[PDB]
Amino acid sequence: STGSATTTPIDSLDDAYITPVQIGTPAQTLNLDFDTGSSDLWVFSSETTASEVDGQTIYTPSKSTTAKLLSGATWSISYGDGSSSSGDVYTDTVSVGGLTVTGQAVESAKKVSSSFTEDSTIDGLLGLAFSTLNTVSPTQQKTFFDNAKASLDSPVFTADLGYHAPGTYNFGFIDTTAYTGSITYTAVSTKQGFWEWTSTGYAVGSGTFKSTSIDGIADTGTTLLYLPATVVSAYWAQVSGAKSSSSVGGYVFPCSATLPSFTFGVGSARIVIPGDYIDFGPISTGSSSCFGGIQSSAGIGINIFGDVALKAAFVVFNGATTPTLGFASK
Ligand SMILES: NCc1ccc(C(F)(F)F)cc1
C-alpha cells in the first residue's frame, strides 16, 4: 500500500510545514510537523495543561474507540533549539494520506515548552528518524514509518517541499514525475539515529566547487541550513555588508542586497539552492537588516541540512535494510 499527503508552510517564510494526520476512531485530524530529525509522534491533547494551549487542535483519546492507554509508559524529549515536551502514551490508529497504521504510539503531551504554545498552527510532531531515538520509557516505541514499512509497496518515503508553496510527502512509492534527471543515492549512517550522510562539497554563486566532505543530517524539522564556520564565512563574504551579529544570533545582511546561490554536492551530482531561498526577511518589523538562511553549526556540534536545502530538491528517504538518501533536482 501507499500514502500521499500535502504539506503546507505555516507562514510566509517557510518556517515550518504542517501535514494533516488522522488519529483515532472516528478520525481526529491534527496538523503535524513531519520531522526526520526526531522519532516521537507527540500531540497536543486534552491532557495538556490548559495554560500551555493557545489555539491548537487537541487529541482527545476519550472520544476514540481505538485508543488504549499504554500503561506505565512516559516520554520526555528536548530538541536542539531548547524546546521540550513530555507526557504519557496511548496507542491508536493513525492515518497519513490514506496510509493507516494500527496500534501506533501516540504520545500525549501533558507539558509543552513556550515555543510550541505560541505556535498555534502546529498541533504536534511526527518523527521520521530511526526508532532508536524514541524517548518512550521503559518500552521504546516505533515510528510511524517503521510500523508502516512492511505494508508499504517500497520501504521509502519522499519529501517534496515547496518554496512559499505547498508540497508533498509520499509513502511507499517514488513519483517519477516530481523531479528532473536522475536520482543520486548516497550512503546513510544510522549510528546516531539520524538520516546522516556526507556531502561531497560546495560552491558559492558561480564560483569554483570546493571538494570537501561535510557530514550532516537531513532534517525536515529544522528550518535553516547549518554548516561549518569555514563554509558559512565563505558564503557571507560574497554579500556586501553581511556580518555575524552576536545580538541577533547569526549572520544578517542588508535587505537591499541580492543573495548568491549555494550549491552542495551529492556524490558527483550538484543541488543548487537559489539565493532567494536564503532570505528570511527583516530581523524585526520595519528593519532594513535581514536574517540569513545559512548559519554556522559551530554552536550545535552537528551539521544540519534543513528545509532551506531540502526544499531545493526531491529527497528520497530509503528505509531498506541498508538505508540510503536520494537527491534529485526538480
Ligand atoms: N528536528 C529535530 C532535531 C533537532 C535538533 C537536533 C540537534 F540539535 F540535536 F542536532 C537534531 C534533530
Side-chain angles (χ1 to χ4, degrees), residues 1 29 72 90 159 167 200:
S1 65
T29 297
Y90 293 83
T200 49

Side-chain angles (χ1 to χ4, degrees), residues 42-45 47-54 56 75 77 79 82-87 107-119 122-124:
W42 74 257
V43 295
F44 280 79
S45 72
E47 315 183 315
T48 311
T49 55
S51 73
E52 313 192 320
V53 170
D54 185 13
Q56 288 89 1
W75 62 278
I77 201 192
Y79 299 95
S83 297
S84 313
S85 47
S86 70
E107 311 172 23
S108 171
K110 302 238 253 193
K111 225 198 172 323
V112 308
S113 43
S114 56
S115 42
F116 294 110
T117 319
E118 283 121 41
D119 220 316
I122 299 172
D123 304 324

Side-chain angles (χ1 to χ4, degrees), residues 161 217-226 273 303-312:
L161 305 174
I217 62 156
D219 186 2
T220 64
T222 290
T223 311
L224 309 180
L225 178 47
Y226 292 96
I273 303 166
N303 299 309
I304 303 174
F305 289 87
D307 293 336
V308 162
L310 301 179
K311 76 173 119 170

